[PDB]
Every structure is written in structure tokens, then in C-alpha cells.
Design an enzyme around this catalytic site. Structure first.
Site, mmCIF file in Angstrom:
data_model
loop_
_atom_site.group_PDB
_atom_site.id
_atom_site.type_symbol
_atom_site.label_atom_id
_atom_site.label_comp_id
_atom_site.label_asym_id
_atom_site.label_seq_id
_atom_site.Cartn_x
_atom_site.Cartn_y
_atom_site.Cartn_z
ATOM 1 N N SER A 75 0.824 -1.229 0.032
ATOM 2 C CA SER A 75 0.007 -0.206 -0.014
ATOM 3 C C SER A 75 0.853 1.226 0.036
ATOM 4 C CB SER A 75 -1.052 0.121 1.283
ATOM 5 O OG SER A 75 -0.557 -0.276 2.417
ATOM 6 N N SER A 76 0.835 2.133 0.957
ATOM 7 C CA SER A 76 1.601 3.529 0.934
ATOM 8 C C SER A 76 2.981 3.138 0.960
ATOM 9 C CB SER A 76 1.007 4.352 1.704
ATOM 10 O OG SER A 76 -0.163 5.129 1.509
ATOM 11 N N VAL A 77 3.671 1.995 1.339
ATOM 12 C CA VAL A 77 4.916 2.005 1.152
ATOM 13 C C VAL A 77 5.415 2.051 -0.044
ATOM 14 C CG1 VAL A 77 6.908 0.551 1.953
ATOM 15 C CG2 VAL A 77 5.075 0.636 3.510
ATOM 16 N N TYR A 103 -3.336 14.224 2.900
ATOM 17 C CA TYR A 103 -2.836 12.822 2.294
ATOM 18 C C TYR A 103 -3.696 12.487 0.874
ATOM 19 C CZ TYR A 103 -0.794 8.230 2.557
ATOM 20 O OH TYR A 103 -0.181 7.099 2.320
#
Length: 381
Positions: free
Chosen positions: A63-65, A170
Site C-alpha cells: 500500500s503506501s510503502v 494525504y
């Protein structure tokens, strides 16, 4: 060292407890000091129902990694002056010219994409039947028939929420950055990532999909008592302050046709992430200049933004700790940190010369639960 096996004691303890409490199903946790792996451990199951043990090489949905990965690709292109921090987006995507509610079409700068000040949003930050829902914009983790371009043309038709540069929110900004990077390099984002990050950093197992079904950790989420597997297209309530409802499709990671989401669509192992975080902490000879690393962990967004709660601003690639005391962390000022809804945390502390990677297969305990913090605490004893 006794201090190194003293650490192993504390960290192992936090992971074993979290499993027995059914808070975490499985994790891979890596710790480096001055670039040397002082701790590496796989705990629990990749898949509980098949009792497949978690191993160090287990691949995860990131995901957001995904963000620090694609932020790194951009910062390298910027070092080489193929891209500018103050380039407009419309210069690279002539059709990406969104308006505020009043009809003004303000220019968005690359530095706004990197720090989430572009005025873009996430559909998962919007209530049901909110403007992104009504337009069919995808956040990068759900099933769709779209190309990236088709998804960003939909995003282009949505109101910005604020003047680019005026505030942190975000966002899908890194999905937009991915498409910019395609125009800079003249090739699709997976090839950009391979050429600009994976090959230079020698990464073994990180990209936008996997054909290795058996080695991808099964995604779980937090329920009644025990965690159950995530079913394609499940709508999960985000923890308070993180948004509303997120749409997850764990099969997406196996689909070679799924559009490359720079913000949320990647897969990879913990050791590839540790290479990335060490690189962000110091630079490397012929990959990233120390000065660029230092630039990426400036508070481009001030700690007024509370990006991980009080004391945290935002840089390029994650949140910047400005006030460790206010944030009640043993981490030191200059710490770069972010996570992933699938259940991840990572940070480097530049003062302590340490990098921490904590990948789990349990949303949201691994991201926002006690687990990432108790690991954090175990590192600093």
C-alpha cells in the site's frame, strides 16, 4: 554484542505477545545501525489457515510503502535535472488541469505532489457518495478496468480542495507523480521503477505485481476478537482520523494488467524496503547525494500539520519529526517515517543512524495499532 541480543529479546517479545494476543498474524521486522542488520526476524504465519510460517523473504502488499519508492524515483530524476521541484504538473500531463470550486485552475508544482499539498484528496478520505465516489476515481488498491491515465483523467475533473502549497492533505498525489515520471522517462511506471530504483539499489523482489502466488503474505484485517482474511472488494472502516471506508482487493497484486498505482499498488519484501530506507537516510555513491537525502527530510510541511499526530511535519517520502517531546517518542528530530494500511511502519532516525522496517499482514494493527509503537520502543530500549 549483549546490547544486540538484548534488543532481539525486547523486539521478539513485542512480536510474540502481539501474535498470542491475536493482534498480529505474522510480521517481518528488520533493524540496521550504521547500515548493518543488527536484527532480522519473521514471526507467525504468512497464511494462518494453511499454517504457512512467515519467512524473511515473504513478499507483502505494500500500500503506501509504495510512496517512498516512487518519491525516490522522482528525486533521482530531479538530481539529474530531467525533472524540476518547481515544474508544473500540466507541463508533463497537459490534460491534468483541475480547478478549485470557484473555477480557478492553479498550477500544481512537483514539490506539492511530493509533500501532499497539491490540493488532491483520497476517495477513502471522502464520505460515501462524495465527489471522488461519484466520479469513479480509484485509490490504487481496488479492482477496476482503468489504465492509470484513465483514472487520472477522472481525478482531473474533481475540484482541488485548496491552493497547491497552502495545506497538507494525504492524497493521490504520488499516483499523479508516477504518470509524470512516465512522461519524463518515456516509458511506463513499472519500467521507470525498474530502471530508476530496483536495478541501481539491487532490489531482489519489488514491483507492481507478482506471479509468485505462494510467497505473497495473505492480507488479514482486525475483527471481533481474531483477524479474518480480506475478501476482494471489502469496505473496511478506517481508524478515526485516517478517513471513512477503504476498498481493498488483495487479488490486485496478482494482476499484471492492474494499473501501476505509485501511491498504493506495489508489492515487495522487507529487505528491499530496508535498502530503500538506508538510501533515504544517508544517500549512496552514484544513486542519491547526501544533500538530496537531507532535502527529503526537511519539514517542507511544518509540524502544525500533525501528520503522525503532534510534532510531525512532512518532507519528500514521509513525515518529519520536528518536536520529539510533543510527539512523546524516543525517536530524535529529523526522523523520517511513514506506513501502509495493509499493516506496515518504517523510519530512519538520522541522529541514531538506525532504520526500522516492520511489515505485517494485519490491517490496521500493523499501521496504526500498538504494534508499530511497541516495536519502536523495543528499538530504543
Amino acid at each position: 554484542s549483549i546490547a544486540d541480543q538484548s534488543l532481539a529479546k525486547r523486539v521478539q517479545g513485542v512480536s510474540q505477545q502481539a501474535i498470542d494476543e491475536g493482534r498480529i498474524v505474522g510480521s517481518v521486522v528488520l533493524i540496521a545501525r550504521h547500515g548493518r542488520v543488527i536484527y532480522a526476524n519473521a514471526s507467525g504465519y504468512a497464511d494462518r489457515e494453511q499454517k504457512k510460517p512467515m519467512v524473511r523473504e515473504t513478499q507483502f502488499r505494500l500500500s503506501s510503502v509504495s510512496k517512498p519508492y516512487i518519491t525516490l524515483a522522482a528525486m533521482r530524476m530531479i538530481e539529474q535535472q530531467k525533472l524540476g521541484l518547481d515544474d508544473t504538473v500540466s507541463r508533463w500531463l497537459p490534460w491534468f488541469t483541475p480547478a478549485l470550486a470557484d473555477g480557478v485552475r492553479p498550477p500544481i508544482k512537483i514539490r506539492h505532489l511530493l509533500s501532499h499539498t497539491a490540493g488532491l484528496d483520497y476517495r477513502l478520505s471522502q464520505p460515501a457518495e462524495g465527489p471522488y465516489h461519484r466520479l469513479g476515481i480509484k485509490d490504487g488498491m481496488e479492482l477496476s478496468s482503468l489504465t492509470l491515465e484513465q483514472n487520472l483523467r477522472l481525478l482531473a475533473q474533481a475540484d482541488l480542495l485548496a491552493e497547491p502549497g497552502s495545506e497538507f492533505r494525504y492524497s493521490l498525489a504520488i499516483d499523479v507523480l508516477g504518470a509524470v515520471l512516465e512522461q519524463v522517462a518515456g516509458e511506463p511506471l513499472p519500467q521507470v521503477f525498474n530502471h530508476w530504483v530496483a536495478q541501481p539499489l539491487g532490489l531482489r523482489n519489488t514491483g507492481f505485481y507478482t506471479t509468485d502466488v505462494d510467497n505473497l503474505a495473505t492480507a488479514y484485517h482486525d475483527t471481533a476478537a481474531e483477524p479474518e482474511p480480506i475478501r476482494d472488494g471489502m469496505l473496511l472502516t478506517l481508524p478515526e482520523g485516517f478517513g471513512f471506508e477503504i476498498e481493498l482487493a488483495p487479488s490486485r497484486a496478482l494482476d499484471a494488467q492492474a494499473y501501476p498505482s505509485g501511491g498504493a499498488g506495489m508489492v515487495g519484501d522487507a529487505d528491499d524496503v530496508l535498502q530503500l530506507v538506508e538510501t533515504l537516510r544517508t544517500g549512496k555513491e552514484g544513486i542519491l547525494q547526501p544533500a538530496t537525502a537531507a532535502l527529503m527530510r526537511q519539514a517542507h510541511v511544518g509540524s502544525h500539520a500533525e501528520t503522525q499526530g503532534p510534532g510531525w511535519g512532512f518532507g519528500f517520502g514521509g513525515a518529519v519529526l520536528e518536536d520529539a517531546q510533543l510527539a512523546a517518542t524516543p525517536q530524535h528530530n529529523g526522523t523520517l517515517q511513514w506506513g501502509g494500511v495493509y499493516g506496515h511502519s518504517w523510519f530512519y532516525d538520522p541522529q541514531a543512524a538506525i532504520s526500522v522496517v516492520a511489515l505485517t499482514n494485519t490491517a490496521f494493527e500493523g499501521m496504526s495499532g500498538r504494534y508499530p509503537l511497541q516495536i519502536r520502543d523495543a528499538v530504543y530500549g
